[PDB]
Amino acid sequence: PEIITPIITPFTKDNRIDKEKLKIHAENLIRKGIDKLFVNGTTGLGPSLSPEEKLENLKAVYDVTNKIIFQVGGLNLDDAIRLAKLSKDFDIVGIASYAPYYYPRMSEKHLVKYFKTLCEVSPHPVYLYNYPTATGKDIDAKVAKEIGCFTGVKDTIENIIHTLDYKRLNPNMLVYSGSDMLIATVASTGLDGNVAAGSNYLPEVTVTIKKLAMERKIDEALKLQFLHDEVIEASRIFGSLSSNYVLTKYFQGYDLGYPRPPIFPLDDEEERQLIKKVEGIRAKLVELKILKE
Amino acid sequence: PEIITPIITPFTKDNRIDKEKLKIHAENLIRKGIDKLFVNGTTGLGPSLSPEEKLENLKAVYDVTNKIIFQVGGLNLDDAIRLAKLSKDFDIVGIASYAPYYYPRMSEKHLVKYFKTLCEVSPHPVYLYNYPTATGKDIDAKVAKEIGCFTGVKDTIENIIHTLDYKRLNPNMLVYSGSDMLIATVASTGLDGNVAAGSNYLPEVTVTIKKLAMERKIDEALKLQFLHDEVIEASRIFGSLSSNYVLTKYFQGYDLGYPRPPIFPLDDEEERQLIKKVEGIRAKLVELKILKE
Amino acid sequence: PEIITPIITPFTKDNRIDKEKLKIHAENLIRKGIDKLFVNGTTGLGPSLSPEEKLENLKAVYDVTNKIIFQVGGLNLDDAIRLAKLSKDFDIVGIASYAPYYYPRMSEKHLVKYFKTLCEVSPHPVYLYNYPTATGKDIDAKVAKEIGCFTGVKDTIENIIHTLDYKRLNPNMLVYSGSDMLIATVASTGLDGNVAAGSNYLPEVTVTIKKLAMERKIDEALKLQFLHDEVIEASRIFGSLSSNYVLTKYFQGYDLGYPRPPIFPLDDEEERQLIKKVEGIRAKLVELKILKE
Amino acid sequence: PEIITPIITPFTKDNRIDKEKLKIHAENLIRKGIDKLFVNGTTGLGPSLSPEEKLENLKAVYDVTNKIIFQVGGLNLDDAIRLAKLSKDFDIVGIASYAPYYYPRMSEKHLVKYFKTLCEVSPHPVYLYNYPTATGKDIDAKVAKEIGCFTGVKDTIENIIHTLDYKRLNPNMLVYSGSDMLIATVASTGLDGNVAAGSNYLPEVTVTIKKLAMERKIDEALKLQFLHDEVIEASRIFGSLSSNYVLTKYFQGYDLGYPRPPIFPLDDEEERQLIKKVEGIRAKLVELKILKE
């Protein structure tokens, strides 16, 4: 099993992608053991990015690694098709798409045709990004099977039954979970890893949890999983997507700039409160030799 | 009470906005008694459009009428601001925004700041577009009060208690329902009207439901309301957003081109079966003398 | 349109039905204009009552009026059948049943057979009590039509579209809403009234709202509807079912004893806080001559 | 980690408990390795039973084994108290209760008081039965802590994060999952077992999934787990609660009589089609040597 980071898109103060901070971030995450980087995901604010900005993100991260899954989805299919075909000049792991978001009451038939169309033109293997809360619909194990062209799936959903079912009905599919809180459980039950936004700022924690669980030291994996769970919870207090920035700076030294409003940056006072709620944890993570400090 | 049409966006075969068919369509809608045009809503595939396309739509419909509500929201706030400010040179009813869609676990503090920011820059009255199922969050009547700058609200939700609560807590706010099925009820219960997707293809019917109910012919209004409900059900079989194009061609006799993939045009056989589902109702409407053969 | 009270079951301090307080309550509600009494509903804690206690309730209330709908549903069909047949010796309006509660994943087929079986043995007309939140399933307009034997329905649900649909698909069905907050809207849109737990303690308010709306004084109906809405809200603070007792005593003089735990009585301090939140309203209702005081 | 059977309640043709078939059934379940028997749960139609019937069930299974968890909750608290206290003369593992079902808008203050009241009178350890979908409310790990007297928890919910959180916040609490599909995962992730309805008719399989996973044969465990999932799916086609009776007769070869209407017995044709859905899986199990022809 692997840890995959849905990597943050860092922005300037005037709302452009800061390619250099993004290279620093990426450089460090690979250094610290992250298997793959999932670019333009929820944590990178892919829905808020233009097609051109989504390619910018790919190119910057490609200046560091090939271990990329390139998310190209959106509400303009011509634009997604375009990005899928542009990716042929990149030796990367694959491309990905969430389901078309926002519009409720879309037929299964239309959702299938959306994906089968991306499969027909993709130069790389295709990964499904299932996030029902965010997109309003669910490409479950059976629909993924009907589509019949996915190499892997990231299943962001609390129901691990749902996630296991992809493996049960598609035994050759790489099946990853989108939860940071299930890193331990995933490694231990026979699934292929986690796409874990929390690995942006505590990649050490996520890699260690996977290893302890790979090593069948379950009580120890759980103990660390539970500390990371408290960190996830803290980041949700002010909005996980904004907090992901403050927590990378705090835990990993470098600054990622700003999010893109309406994903508003925390203010200095929120930054401080968020720190205060994790500095006890950081202590225990250095006391546990997982963090350098 | 008003009937407001969230106007469909006609696209050309090569996925561009057909401004000429849009002008024809908006002309007919005003000629038939539609009070106002809601531009770049769900029915017009607002979230599928770029800032520049949302503006193209304002300009096309403004060469035909100035009874426009201009929907301008999105996931890049600087673009909503830019579109807000641009509308100063236009004599229109107002601007509107849905809540930021896609991202769950957004703070109330941030949702509020987003809507307040659009009020601070708006040169026209600002209308709230509440669509919890489509956007993932609920700007209910308490939050709309705390925001404090909304002239009106469109409440697309299957719960009229929730809609009534806007009038109760914001007595001077225009309160509209997003439902085609609640025209008789809204008129009859003292609310200010309906933003009805179905009035794209049957404005005569929506206008007449409202008229009867305000003439206190509650019984004929329901009678007509129930036939309209059957057309809405028809349209949902294959997806309302796509079936809306077919139903306009059929009922109003001009062609609105193509939706934007991932919103997929009905194929000829879906087109066939849909018409079969409504042709009986079209007959009834010609007999009641609401439509012309 | 009518107002129907889902009447409170009053209990002694040692957990028996207090038949005499129940007769007082019933006597008064009819005096104050209530069309019908719905016995063993949610507000009367029907699920917490044995078959024998459900007959006790019927007999007591029958010592006052025939205008009774007798709810007999439960998770033992033999017991429901028994109560349905026992009711032949009562000249009452009808019998009723919520859907079988608790167990999720029941087939439509089994839910239909439950009701068609009660219809086959009932000596009175049969009323459907649809409450999806409480029972976990929804006997919608189409399923009610399939069952094909209901004289009326009480639809407890915020979606008035859902409720209207019963009339649209079953034009001969008496269609009532379970909301206290929609009394005005129901009267005004062409439906047949409300089963309103709040009429237990402010029957004056509910009857007046209906009349003002029947009289097309919509602005005035709404104004009073909105005061009653604040009273409903207040009763939810501590648990609507327990609060219904305190509010009857306060607004109507007589005491109904206790609920049945786990529906726990309010404590003296909660009683006091609940009063404080409504005494302003009571003032305005006496100032408006709806209440005697 | 333990496999616990929520044991089916066999009824006679005239809707009485067939104690003799219940003893036979509980004997076989213990002989095949079931750790403990959960009596009067959902699978045993707990909410359909009267206090006196819940007791009849304890006594029948106690003539066979004393590894009983005795479920005693309901909507009349005095009866749950009475059943709690009665169990003092029985050498059993503990008593359990689901949260009060049916009534929505119940206060946390009241739910807590209910569970605390059963602890104050219990003569045995008390287990929490969390089934939010069936009861309408969620006693999550925070509330179970605030209550403070639970020896264990059965968490029937399709969200293992929610289940894990019990161990994290109550480290000494036995934490069980209500899912048949999560046996491999629970064993492998450090939780204490599964209360698995499916182990009524396939205890050999449930027991063997757990064994493999604890021998670290994670792969064979999933292989076997996935076949079990198909049997669970089969059982849900016509309703799990009824299909459970048919599946026991088929797999274990003794007849458990009848469920209790509104839980309706499958008719001969449903019985036929269900068997057809599983007979292929029974074959596979005889080949893997988990069952005997």
Please report, for the domain that includes residue B14, its CATH number.
3.20.20.70
Chain B: closest CA distance from residue A218 (Å): 30
The amino acid sitting at C153 is V
Which member of A76, A104, A113 has the closest CB to residue B264? A113
Cβ neighbours of residue C55 under 8 Å, at least 6 residues apart?
Answer: C83, C86
Number of B–C residue contacts, CB under 8 Å: 66
**N residues, chain A:** 293
B171 close to B141: Cβ distance less than 8 angstroms: no
Query: Which of D168, D167, C98 is closest to D176 using CA atoms?
Result: D167
Which chain C residues have a beta carbon less than 8 Å from that of D45? 75
Instruction: Tell me if A164 and D179 make a contact (CB, 8 A cut-off).
Output: no
Q: Which of D204, D166, D158, D203 lies closest to D185 in space, CA to CA?
A: D158
- Cβ A264–B113 below 8 Å, yes or no? yes
Q: How far, in Å, CA of A184 to CA of A192, rounded? A: 12
Judge residue D96's burial from the number of C-beta atoms within 10 Å of its C-beta, 0-12 exposed, 13-18 middle, 19 or more buried: buried
H or E segment to which residue B71 belongs:
strand B68-71
Query: Distance from CA of residue B200 to its chain's centroid?
Result: 9
- D30, D57 in Cβ contact below 8 A? no
Contact B115, B130 (CB under 8 A): no
* DSSP classification of residue A41: S
Residues in chain C: 293
DSSP A266: P
Q: Is C151 helix (H, G, I), strand (E, B) or coil?
A: strand
Closest CA to A82 of A74, B52, B75: A74
Prior bond of A262 cis (ω within 30°): yes
Q: What is the stated resolution of the deposited model, in angstroms?
A: 2.3
| Three-state SS sequence of chain D | CEEEEECCCCECCCCCECHHHHHHHHHHHHHCCCCEEEECCCCCCHHHCCHHHHHHHHHHHHCCCCCEEEECCCCCHHHHHHHHHHHHHCCCCEEEEECCCCCCCCCHHHHHHHHHHHHHHCCCCEEEEECHHHHCCCCCHHHHHHHCCEEEEEECCCCHHHHHHHHHHCCCCEEEECCCCCHHHHHHHCCCEEECHHHHCCHHHHHHHHHHHHCCCHHHHHHHHHHHHHHHHHHHHCCHHHHHHHHHHHHHCCCCEECCCCCCCCCHHHHHHHHHHHHHHHHHHHHCCCCCC
Taking the C-alpha atoms of residue C219 and residue C200, their distance in angstroms, rounded to an integer, is: 25
Query: Which DSSP helix (H) or strand (E) runs through A203?
Result: helix A203-214
Alpha helices per DSSP H over chain C: 19-31, 51-62, 77-86, 108-121, 132-135, 141-147, 160-169, 183-189, 203-214, 218-237, 240-252, 268-287
Q: Quick check: C27 and C20 in contact, CB under 8 A?
A: no
Determine the structural domain holding residue B97 and report its residue range.
1-293
Euclidean distance between CA atoms D212 and D217, whole angstroms: 5
Q: Please give the interface size between C and D, counted as residue pairs whose CB atoms are below 8 Å apart.
A: 103
Partners of A158 on chain D (C-beta within 8 Å) are 158-162
Q: Residue A241: in which H helix or E strand, if any?
A: helix A240-252
Dihedral angle computed from the Cα positions of residues C24, C25, C30 and C35, in that order, rounded to the nearest 10 degrees: -150
> Is residue A200 within 8 Å of A45, Cβ to Cβ?
no
B277 annotated ligand-binding residue = no
- Under DSSP, the state recorded for B198 is G
DSSP 8-state assignment for residue C257:
B
CA separation for the pair A281, A250 (Å, rounded): 12
The Cα–Cα gap between A241 and A130 comes to 18
Q: Please tell me whether C127 is known to bind a ligand.
A: no
Q: What is the distance between the alpha carbons of residues A290 and A293, in angstroms, rounded to a whole number?
A: 9
Q: Is chain D adjacent to chain B, meaning 3+ CB pairs within 8 angstroms?
A: no
Q: D188: how many CB neighbours lie within 10 A of its CB?
A: 27
Look at residues D268, D265, D261, D262 and name the one whose alpha carbon lies nearest to residue D242.
Answer: D265
Contact at 8 Å (CB) between C236 and C202?
Answer: no
Nearest chain A CA: its distance from B81 CA (Å):
11
Q: Cα Rg for chain A, rounded, in angstroms?
A: 18
Could you confirm whether B154 is annotated as catalytic?
A: yes
Taking Cα atoms as reference points, which of A262, B189, B245 lies closest to residue C185?
Answer: B189
- DSSP H or E stretch at residue A276: helix A268-287
Question: In whole angstroms, what is the distance from residue A19 CA to residue A12 CA?
Answer: 9
CB-based burial of residue A196 (10 Å sphere; 0-12 exposed, 13-18 middle, 19+ buried)? Answer: buried
Count of domains in chain B? 1
Q: Which tokens hold the place of D272?
A: 């036929």
Best CA proximity match to B260, nearest among A74, A26, D238, D211: A74
Q: Do D189 and A190 touch (CB under 8 A)?
A: no
Q: Are C293 and C286 in contact (CB under 8 A)?
A: yes
Specify the amino acid at residue A274.
Answer: L
| B188 vs C165, C181, C189: nearest CB | C189
3-state secondary structure of B164: helix
Bridge partners (DSSP) of residue B128 are B97, B153
- CA–CA dist C117, D133 (Å, integer): 26
Task: Report the candidate in D93, D82, D147 with the shortest Cα–Cα distance to residue D121.
Answer: D82
Way it was determined: X-ray
* B191/B182 Cα distance (integer angstroms): 11
Nearest residue to B43 via CA among A99, A111, A103, A74: A103
Residues of chain A positioned with their CB less than 8 A from the CB of D222 = 164, 167, 189-190
**Sign, CA torsion D32/D36/D37/D42:** negative
The answer to whether the CB of B61 falls within 8 A of the CB of B23 is: yes
State the Cα–Cα distance between residues A90 and C38, nearest whole angstrom. Answer: 71
Question: Alpha-carbon distance D118 to D97, whole Å?
Answer: 9
d(CA B191, CA B171): 11
Q: Which of B98, B35, B97, B45 is nearest to B68 (CA)?
A: B35
